[PDB]
């Protein structure tokens, strides 16, 4: 098995988190990849250690009570902080303990994607992977910088009373589990975008099928000018592309299964944090609005909990749009195809595939990842805030 | 008519409840079954007796007022307890009074399922039925143990003032109606899972149809190694399987009709209890949090009201997934099938059946049983609790 | 044009309300029907008179203020009573002013339904029309009896202080507008059920098509035993039935257009009244619970506002179920039909009609009339009541 | 490129707003149109100037505080006024800065619509364009009159204390941004209605196809009587119309993309204003109800925020209805078409296009513009108001 681009890059990053217990073997543009049981062992230790340190750190700060426990200014603030920590520990737990089975799934289906790549002539655009690798760095580095500021702030807030080393021992684990949760979200997105790039490329082979029938080996090649061009009759190409369309839908279901449970806990904790964080921001902007550094951080957290949702639902939406574009192309193409020909009989099949096999991500069946899920989540958030804030 | 496995086992359990007024006649791996009017008569008496005892027990505890009526610490607590008892008495009532007509329906369609079993070569996996029979015992015995603890607790709470025998006379009926409601939920689930096992087995016959056309009597048999293998040409098999697909969809509609009204009252009472039970738990964890045994029981009830919902919606979701798997297989299979052949003409039919006949449970048309119903119910529960608790 | 049964009976009742400005000419089992401009003129006067009397009666009771205005015990109670009266006056207004155009539509499509009746051999079951005519009498007479009790109660409540004749002059108009709104709801239901009976009868002709192909003039006749039997080859019958299926879907869209705007205002006022009526019931059962006659009436109103919703959504749901039954029959029938025959080519067409033309009522596009609309309405009602009642 | 009617008229109006940076060249019934970079430059200046003046005007009135700041009678009233201004400045910003790319899109697809017009024989009905041009004038002039009254009122309210010139300098910019937002909404509606007129006209060519096959060059012409009549065999017409159906669906997706982001911000601000405006109306009708001129204006604003929503969702709904009418016609037409003919093979294709390519507007994928979006928005509005008003 081989992997490249920003998907291969996030797997390197995820390996240290224990989210991708893989060995990597550098080729020209790709790495060869296999499971490593030693990294699974390391990965299981790391997250278990961090969860123990996080729970006992939580117990310690509850034991300090509500006066000095900066995250826990009240009995109810203790419960909120415990649930916040709990959902992150559960999300990072499911993320890391599930990772070996998820990589076994990835290496299983990637052998079929390689066959699709050959038919499409897939080659990794350096400019495009640089865009997506820069986006990994942008999102992940920005979040890492936020975690450091949040930790430094609360440590200095306690450092004003000499208690910073205890705060470090009690919360350092929680910030590492935060990093693991974002890397898991980025690992999905750039896995899903890596498939969306192949639907997008499959649709271009189907357009050039239409242009050849409109305006008359592996399926598609570059010309001497590098433009896409078709090496086989459209009758054969549509049959070959119909098989590839089935394969891409199967890969979608493996991705949605492997990340399905993580994504549900990520969605609930997003919803939780988008209620909890604006609430205490609003309470603190009405009362003691002089704590400007706190208010800045809590705003940047509200922003981050929205981005973390978009990182999940947007890669899926962009995959839906490529499916809709296929239906548009096939409709056009089958009005062009002549009556009673072989090509139109191949397009009768493909159009049934479009009606039968949709491409979608529905984690555990609870919901469909698409932009209407944003409207659903934000409508709930504002409903609860209007209830909670108004009194 | 004959029935086996965990479905036949839950029918034995349900017979004593009067939910399955059947005689049973043991064969090698199955029971022969027919309606017994005497068990219908017994069943109608039993539930009518228990409902009378429950209503008059409710009247008695309202008559004791709010001081000593342990379930009724206030005027509003009286109304809550009356509605709790009322929905259980209605659910057990519809369950037991409807049971003879429901068994007549079961024995009507099971004669067709036997024909599907012959074509598929269905035989009951001892290991699989042991799994599902152990799951019946696990869920039902755990609930029975909870009912005993709840009853013993409140009787001892009253026994501290000598009034336990009156509590026994006033609530024993209600705990038996609770048991009847769970057995009805388990009777559905293991009826639905018994069908899902046959869709799952029908899909495997359709995969081996694809492998024979990919890599070239009743439809399917075991090899000498026990692997599935096809005794007829794929052209005949797909036609035979299309007929069986229609039969399974028809059986789904009989199950959804027979249990439809029970399931709606089960869903409302789940929603009611998931509001009422966490509310009084939260009031009692803020005030008088020393009543640790009460808080433990009320938590185990909240857990149970979630499980009772999953027992209903999960068997249906797992049945949807087998239908989606059929669409995936048929798409694959009809790209493999050659142009203009008989097989592809048989697959044109089957693909129309998939678009026309879905397999789903929609009780009384109110809703579809699937995991999105969990999100809908839990979002309402938390909306009401946020309203009720916040003031 | 001719019409019979409970549909023809409700048109007689509706004529006096001005909801069906028709002449009627009695035949053996049917009436001949044509528009009468004189009844349109009468109808426009009647509702305009009743609306004037109702508005000026409302103005009078607002002018008496909140002390003696029994419907208006507070400033807010004035606003509630005004909106209650307003939505009924608007619903009866749209009902009666729209009625001539609606009857022109009815007489337009009923000429095509007569053609469907000939093909199906439709004859009116005396026992069935007696059921539906008894249901008209049951629902309408029960409501009329409730209106009289409500009016007599409030007149006697004012009659205890001699003011009953003013109450009569100020509210008699409103009770007649209430009667007009129910007759409009019954006029829809028994129009929709009159179509559902023809889908139900069309599906039976399609089953006997299957039995003739399974077990081998106008389309269908009774045997000498009165059992349905087919007078033409199944190849012709399926073609003839496909045309009739199109005609029934067209009639559905005329009904949904003609009653669409009434039904939306009926749904909002149902939602309004299911909030307003339980609220003031709950306030009056907590405080001054001795007003037993008031509490009884307000409960019977809550019951009536639910029934008025079911009268609207249930006839539509039962029409959906007959469409689903067609899809089940066509799937079965086209697995039975032989490969490459004419019959299977006719069933390819019909199955496309089922996928393209659904049968549904969606008033003004706002919603679909089906039992999920009950869950939507009742969830809102309980959301508002939980907000309003809890403080 | 050429454009006519109320679409061409709203583009003239939009040019001064900078929403359509176009030159216009008058022909007999149409204008020739091309992008003008000078109007893009003017347009970017104008909105940037107005946004600067609006923000600094907002800063000034916040700087005057809450006593004299008539829009800002409290600290919370400051925040409300700032968000109101902010969403309008954002909506007008996206409107005007996006306008050049949107016009490039319009001139791209309008060249294909001209081809559809030739096939359909499209000519602009003077009476119909007069209706839609009068509707532009009615809606836009009525809104302009409301803006003047609102501005004159608040200036005179401040003019009673000599501060009117400062109010003019601080709010004149905001009223011009309000005008730009309505013109953008009208620019969409009359673009969408301009397409709906061509679906409506395409459906009439398909009916006359049915009548010619029922009752036996560019596709369609007027007779010597001006009735539509078909110049080609139905076999060719259905093929030609299938291609045109694809082209119209493509144009729909360009419109939805170009206006998609504006429409989402328009929907949120509609939702915001339908909460905020009735709330402060209700507070001001309970307390100080003597401010009759204020109450009148705030009611006319509530009315306007509903109309602004209908202006957006109704043109889209009317486009859905023409698609449904196509499905009705195609079903009818393909029962009429003879078995095994060429025409029925052309109708097999078109019916797949109807199942694959729907016509809809879904801005950014968040929602579908149709009348169910009204019910969704108004249910939220009343939920928040019931929460906010009740305490
Ligand atoms: C965000 C983009 C929303 C654009 C779509 C327009 C709103 C469509 C609508 O009308 O839906 C409403 C949106 O509710 C809502 O306030 C949800 C919108 C609240 C926006 C809160 C600020 C978001 C900042 C980014 C109702 O939501 P539900 O279905 O949950 O009930
Ligand atoms: C539970 C699994 C939920 C996973 C799906 C992520 C949530 C999707 C969403 O955004 O839907 C929201 C879930 O509301 C909600 O808080 C529902 C989730 C509340 C969870 C309460 C604890 C559940 C413990 C098990 C809105 O729900 P509605 O449609 O009724 O309005
Ligand atoms: C009534 C039959 C309801 C059976 C369906 C089970 C409930 C399914 C569900 O979970 O839906 C919930 C039903 O809410 C609700 O309490 C609606 C049910 C409230 C019932 C109030 C008493 C009805 C008496 C008849 C959420 O409703 P929404 O979609 O509006 O948010
Ligand atoms: C307006 C036309 C509405 C006609 C449709 C009947 C209502 C259907 C329904 O039952 O839906 C309810 C309408 O809620 C609602 O009060 C929405 C209706 C509130 C109407 C407020 C006055 C509108 C004045 C024009 C629930 O709405 P959601 O889905 O957001 O939860
Ligand atoms: C605090 C809560 C943190 C843990 C929450 C539980 C997360 C789910 C873990 C269970 C799980 O996902 O199963 C793991 C496998 O289950 C496990 O082994 C992980 C759960 C056990 C955790 C306890 C520590 C394990 C030993 C640590 C020393 C090594 C993989 O399952 P499949 O891929 O489906 O096979
Ligand atoms: C407290 C409320 C408890 C009872 C609630 C009503 C539950 C529904 C019972 C009605 C019912 O479902 O019908 C029964 C049949 O109806 C019945 O007979 C049961 C209702 C009558 C209950 C009164 C006692 C019956 C006599 C008891 C002595 C034997 C079967 O109907 P189908 O299967 O559709 O035919
Ligand atoms: C005061 C008196 C109160 C009366 C209650 C009125 C309630 C409102 C109902 C008014 C409409 C009446 C009606 O529909 O009567 C139908 C009755 O129609 C029926 O046959 C009733 C069918 C049984 C009711 C449905 C049972 C539950 C199964 C529903 C299907 C769920 C499918 C789920 C998949 C989406 C007449 O049709 P017939 O066939 O002749 O009897
Ligand atoms: C209080 C509010 C009560 C009236 C509310 C308005 C109800 C709608 C009435 C308008 C209407 O529906 O149009 C009528 C026709 O419009 C009308 O004529 C009725 C509205 C005018 C009402 C004023 C009284 C009419 C003269 C009364 C003397 C005769 C029929 O329209 P189409 O069938 O679509 O054609
Ligand atoms: C207060 C907030 C008002 C501005 C909100 C931002 C609105 C979106 C503007 C960005 C945008 O839409 O992009 C513009 C192009 O982006 C822009 O140039 C507009 C944003 C820059 C605004 C700052 C002023 C520009 C210079 C003004 C002097 C000329 C067109 O994008 P495409 O059509 O997709 O290509």
Author numbering:
A (entry chain D), B (entry chain A), C (entry chain B), D (entry chain C): 16 to 231, 270 to 444
Quoted passage from the original study:
When expressed in Xenopus oocytes, this construct was activated by d-fructose, but not by D-glucose, with an EC50 of 22 mM, consistent with the published EC50 and specificity of wild-type BmGr9.16 We produced detergent-solubilized BmGr9 and used single-particle cryoelectron microscopy (cryo-EM) to obtain a 2.85-Å map, which we used to build a structural model of BmGr9. The cryo-EM map of agonist-free BmGr9 contains strong density features that do not correspond to protein, especially in the intersubunit lipid inlets. We assigned several features to ordered phospholipids rather than detergent based on their well-resolved bidentate shapes. Four ordered lipids (one per subunit) project their head group from within the hydrophobic region of the bilayer into the aqueous ion pore, sealing intersubunit fenestrations in the pore walls. Each lipid enters the pore between adjacent S7b helices at the level of the inner leaflet. In BmGr9, T435 and Y437 form polar contacts with the pore-penetrating lipid head group. In agonist-free BmGr9, starting from the extracellular face, the pore begins with a closed double-layer hydrophobic gate formed by F444 and I440 at the S7b C terminus. Like L473 in AbOrco and V468 in MhOr5, the four F444 side chains protrude into the channel lumen to close the ion pathway down to a 2.5-Å diameter, creating a hydrophobic plug.
GRs mediate chemosensation by forming ligand-gated cation channels. However, some GRs do form functional homomeric channels, including D. melanogaster Gr43a and its Bombyx mori ortholog (Bm)Gr9, which are selectively activated by fructose. BmGr9 is a C4-symmetric tetramer with the ion pore on the central 4-fold axis. As anticipated from its homology to ORs, each BmGr9 subunit contains an N-terminal intracellular S0 helix and seven transmembrane helices (S1 to S7), with S7 broken into S7a and S7b.
